[model samples]
Target: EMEKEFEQIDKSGSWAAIYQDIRHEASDFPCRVAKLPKNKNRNRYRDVSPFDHSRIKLHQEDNDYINASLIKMEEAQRSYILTQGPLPNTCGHFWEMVWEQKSRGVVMLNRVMEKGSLKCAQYWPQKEEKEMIFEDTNLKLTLISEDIKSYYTVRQLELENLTTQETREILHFHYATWPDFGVPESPASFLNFLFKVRESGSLSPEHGPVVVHCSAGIGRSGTFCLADTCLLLMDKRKDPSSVDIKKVLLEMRKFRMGLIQTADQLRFSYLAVIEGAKFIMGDSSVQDQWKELSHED
Candidate 1:
């Protein structure tokens, strides 16, 4: 019946039209014209500013701030700090926010390089043989180790506060292969990636919210949350049909606007939720399917 259920969503224009309707109905955000004044320049890109209501603020000592939003899904008991890729000028602010927030992990869905352009600042210590110092924030980030997977990379980040000489390890999970404005080749690989993040326990609440970002932080970032949240609901509710994908996405968008940026990304999210539901609902063969999908020519 799963295939039959998808018939409506699979129609050529069904998801696209529904996506349009969702956006059209979500445009009445409260006005905070004085929030992101032009002089701040916290956003890496001009168009990716965080909305005022849910924007994460700096501590009392924040002589500065960054463009980031803290999205909390109480039903799912999950929190994600969505942010844009760090800009050169904001790199110090990025680490400062991380240190102050006590975050245990950072999830990056973008790469440092994109289509012959720099998409994210080299914010981490890439060299495995040594460590990098962040003098501006008075912190030290060392790449303790790295394990490269088929479509993603996991790095052990050792963050230390220079002033206190205190240190903690932060898990950094980076999905490096996904293209800009596009989905992965299929939901199988994408589900596998999401499962990996979940397995790491980085998204757990005991730590500060996991920081998630891509270049703009709303498009790819939104898709990542949408799929994960829906799949989680399907697992918890014991019925994929019971979880309303559009409703959850709309609620998340209220925290950060324009999530799941394209019709393709929205379409991709549905596929992932469907495929993921099968795994949680007792399909033993789904992992094998993903393995075979990964071996394609």
Candidate 2:
């Protein structure tokens, strides 16, 4: 059953048609995402818009509008606070939400800068800086640990609640290799990166949902969640055939618009999920496959 779907996705014209159909559905889905042309310079793109029905509304004093949404796959035991990269003014609020939501980790799929474009606000500190101190919310994010890899970087950040004087460690899983407006070259590297995030125990039920974002927070962000959720489903069901990749993606799209942005992304998503299922089924060779994918850069 799994291979049949994979072959179907691999077929010529199938993925293109599927992508077109997804766009059609999204266009007609009544996207009442805020019309924020007033701050045209603040938005990343005119095209990537969130669905107001599912958009995350900020309770703190502000525009009450942040280009973020909560993506919850309840059955699969996964939840992600999906949001756009922070703007300069909203960085405080971004951290503020993390503190209030008690999120345990942040899965950053984009970079501070990408391909000669400003993909997102420089929301966190770079290596030169040891900590990030926010103004309005009185939050301090201290960098505790850092691990750099060929395609990704993992950092342990300490988010402190200055009011209550409580500090919580937050994992920042940054996939630095993904290019702007592009998919990872292969699913193997992405899946390996994803499993690392899973192993951190940050995405567990004991903690809040892991925050996942790219620039627009729908394209790469959605793809990451989709692949992870599918793998989790397969792992839960104890059989690869028990999970339905396409069906789960379409369902996730219901909560966020234009997920898995391109036909290519949709296609790559299948490969990653299938690759992950192999790993789930105890194929040690899967690690070698991922290694090759990583070296391909």
Candidate 3:
């Protein structure tokens, strides 16, 4: 009966049922539940500086290794400028922030896989030369058949034409989505990813710093940069005895205002850094000791 039930559950992919069965049986379950440590202290730099024209200038001077270019500057109550410059290109349909240390300019570049894919709707620039055909305006959503691999030939041609430099040290932001609530599934994955990228050595000295970005360039991006910087500082020290994560975060904001904008994003920042510390320290007890020594709250 147990074998039959297990086979049925396996076929159905009902993890909750499997968990229930394990709990019902008088057997030792391997699964362990760990409560993520909380950041008791409030983020002091929350009200420091929101994103504005003045703050953007400050970021350019200090935190950012790149210069901000104003292709078209608009003078409203709060002046807004449409920045333009070269940026590194990721081979997918997403936004990437590229930093050129030699040129001292940061570029935000967008990629589109298909001319009229769903992802391109919000990002693609308007084209006036195209004819007003029904097919031209709507996205071509048909999936490529397995036999017709030649469709990718055009995509390869387009990729070759892009002038942006590709770097191995690519950083990604992992925000807490549904079910997980406020915790990341595996924080260690990103640490390992960074280590692998660094090992590749494709990152140029001219682009010494890693480029990070999300939709708005605030929530996930801020958390990723702040967490990585804190972890790097901890690693350099070897002993996490004297490091203060909160101070590190505040210092980051001092250079670039609104490093962690929303309250939730701020919370996630602390969580990710602690997760990173745990990963590096190895022993859970050691992590607790480090947390007690370094964290005031």
Candidate 4:
């Protein structure tokens, strides 16, 4: 009778119920779940940045062919290139786009380059202290930084430069590398990284907004933007607030076509936010607490 009831429950609720039941029965279930508090007063989603889809314009081609509808010449603050795969040996038609956008304020070129190419020489701007400007167009390219003020903001977590390299190592040393999916060894380190960027004065409210891009501008870049926005929103915790992951992803898509391309990347992004929130709450044991509550329910 118990077996039949279990089978019926499993059949009705899908495999999720079976897994839940198995965990419930197990004496030593290792996995921990977190139950976020349902406090109406705590604004956990505010202070995070919001995405402005209207701001980003995508140009799709080997080089650059201006698409009028997709890219409004008058309004575009910056142009981004999410390369299809590895950057081509030659820059193809990139020069044309640079010249076009240079008349505007600045043109931010975001991409990776193959070894031993002129494009590779121009991969990052020349003058470190000065905003790196492309000679042909005089358009400046700033690298991404956590400071948010950086005209170009690279993921602090992924920064490989000597000055910024520590951020990546600290994260890896603590969280384990890419596929392992373990908790950060020291959550404080993560918070410190955020604080350092905030203190850098680059992310000022007056400096318009920073440009963010990673190879595809969707995977690593999407994760960085999504995590930053979600955390900021949670901090504000405004009324009638909700996070629609699909909506966020959709907005990113309209900006660059394939933001959050893979299911694994998307899933990892959500998990990163959840884990980040738990760390902020000072609850290292959140996962364990959630598991216990699930059993009682």
Question: Higher TM-score: candidate 2 or 4?
Answer: 2
Task: Give residue 137's lDDT in candidate 4 (0 to 100).
Answer: 29
Per-residue lDDT tens digits of candidate 3, residues 35-54? Answer: 11221111112222222322
Task: Give the winner by lDDT.
Answer: 1
Error of 2 at 292 (Å): 6.8
The TM-score obtained by model 4 is 0.41
Tell me the tens digit of each residue's lDDT in model 2 across 62-156.
45666777777878878888888888877877888888778888999998888787877888776536688887778988878788888888988
Arranged by lDDT with the best first, the candidates are 1, 2, 4, 3
Alpha carbon lDDT of residue 10, candidate 2? 73
lDDT of 1 at 156: 91
Error of 2 at 132 (Å): 2.1
Give lDDT tens digits, candidate 4, residues 172-253: 0111111211222232333333333334433334332333333333444454455555555554553113544444445444
RMSD of every candidate to native, in Å, equals 2.5, 2.6, 19.2, 17.4
Q: What's model 2's overall lDDT?
A: 0.79
How far out, in Å, is residue 288 in model 2?
6.3
- The order of the candidates by TM-score, greatest first, is 1, 2, 4, 3
lDDT by residue for model 1 (95-213), tens: 77888888888889988999899999998988966777777778888899988877788899888989999999999989877898888878887877787788888877788888889
Off by over 4 Å in 2: 26-33, 36-43, 128-130, 288-297
10 residues in a row with least lDDT, candidate 2 = 26-35
